[PDB]
A paper describes a structure:
Diffraction data were collected, and a 1.8 Å structure was solved using the anomalous signal from a single zinc ion present in the protein. Residues 4,730–4,830 of UBR4xtal were not resolved, so a model could only be built for residues 4,831–5,183. Our structure is composed of two apparent subdomains that constitute a larger fold. The N-terminal subdomain comprises residues 4,835–4,948 and is followed by the second subdomain containing 11 α-helices that run to the native UBR4 C-terminus. As such, we consider this subdomain a novel fold and refer to it as the UBR zinc-finger interacting (UZI) region. Our experimental structure confirms the structural role of conserved residues Cys4838, Cys4841, Cys4890 and His4887 as zinc coordinating ligands. Although not evident from primary sequence, the zinc finger has partial structural homology with canonical RING domains (DALI Z-score range 2.0–5.8). However, residues essential for coordinating the second zinc ion (referred to hereon as the distal Zn2+ site) are conspicuously absent. Substituting for the second zinc ion are four residues that form hydrogen bonds, and are probably required for stabilizing the cross-brace architecture of the zinc finger subdomain. However, the SP-RING maintains the distal Zn2+ site, rather than the proximal site, and lacks the extended βAB sheet. Thus, to our knowledge, the UBR4 zinc finger has unprecedented RING-related architecture, and we refer to it as the hemiRING.
Author numbering: 4833 to 4896, 4902 to 5183
The structure:
């Protein structure tokens, strides 16, 4: 079996083309936005994974839901969910059933009302932020790292895309995203402390903008992340104006730039993905690509993590970031770009 295989029965799509495969996950309730300027922060959830894979049928048979039992097939690391993937010959009714099962798993471990695609987008955002903040992937589960969790990312994306496409919500979110991009500069500092802020809308863009539109938008996203980092560094308690517009130590911007880098690297994984199909645009064509390309995606994710770890993480200055990011032909002088951008904010 060249592709994803169930660790219980050792079979995948070659011998079981219609059996749903799933990824063991561990999810916990967290604040959506730690910088939210409110004593009661809006709650969501953050998922991690060791990227251990089982059939939904095989897991449910061994249960005879009991996650103490499942941990033994999960390399002795904690799990409380089973994120389904949608194989090319798996019937949609079987996938949808297992996705409903996973949403029940998510409710039971997060005290959530209902897992929405918006909360799943925040989940991806929080996962990206764990890469970018160099926070532990294994402290709660006992095992897992950047390697296992980079491989989870395409499959959480697919669950967002599946719901976006089945409920016909993409065009609405395209308008929401354009609304964010059209916010005047007098709004940027406030957006830095909102739940649905630049980090959220960047992850939303990955789900609905094709690679060329990301190319035409990524520098403006970079501006939004740089201003967001400035406001959060100088006024962690919240602000509406940028009182301190002076360039700070690179630590002020480091995590936001790693966040940008990870998004850019995932777009690079999907660089040649068809941009429309019979059913819709990017949100549809990317979902179809993910269903059919487990192994090419596995290869591209390892390469993306290699670039992230070997090139972006050692970056120490904004000029070095632009070099590694391949942005120097679009941003001539890093020093002037950052200084002028921050001074431009009210
Ligand atoms: Zn199996």
């Amino acid at each position: 079996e060249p592709g994803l295989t169930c660790c219980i029965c050792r079979e995948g799509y070659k011998f079981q083309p219609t059996k749903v495969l799933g990824i063991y996950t561990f999810t916990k309730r967290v604040a959506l936005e730690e910088l939210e300027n409110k004593p009661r922060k809006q709650q969501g959830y953050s998922t991690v994974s060791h990227f251990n894979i089982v059939h939904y049928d095989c897991h449910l048979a061994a249960v005879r839901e009991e996650w103490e039992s499942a941990a033994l097939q999960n390399a002795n690391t904690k799990c409380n969910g089973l994120l389904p993937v949608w194989g090319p010959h798996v019937p949609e009714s079987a996938f949808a059933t297992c996705l409903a099962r996973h949403n029940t798993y998510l409710q039971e471990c997060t005290g959530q009302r209902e897992p929405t695609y918006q909360l799943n987008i925040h989940d991806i955002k929080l996962l990206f932020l764990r890469f970018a903040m160099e926070q532990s992937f294994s402290a709660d589960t006992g095992g897992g790292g950047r390697e296992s969790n980079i491989h989870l990312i395409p499959y959480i994306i697919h669950t967002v895309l599946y719901v976006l496409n089945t409920t016909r919500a993409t065009s609405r979110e395209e308008k929401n995203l354009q609304g964010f991009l059209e916010q005047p500069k007098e709004k940027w500092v406030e957006s830095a402390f909102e739940v649905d802020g630049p980090y959220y809308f960047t992850v939303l863009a990955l789900h609905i903008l094709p690679p060329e539109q990301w190319r035409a938008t990524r520098v403006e996203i970079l501006r939004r992340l740089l201003v967001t980092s400035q406001a959060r560094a100088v006024a962690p308690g919240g602000a509406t104006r940028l009182t301190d517009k002076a360039v700070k130590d690179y630590s002020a911007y480091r995590s936001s730039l790693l966040f940008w880098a990870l998004v850019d690297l995932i777009y690079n994984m999907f660089k040649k993905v068809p941009t429309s199909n019979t059913e819709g645009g990017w949100s549809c064509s990317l979902a179809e690509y993910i269903r059919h390309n487990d192994m090419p995606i596995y290869e591209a994710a390892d390469k993306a993590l290699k670039t992230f770890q070997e090139e972006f993480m050692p970056v120490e200055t904004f000029s070095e970031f632009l070099d590694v990011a391949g942005l120097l032909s679009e941003i001539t002088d890093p020093e002037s770009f950052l200084k002028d951008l921050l001074n431009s904010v009210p």
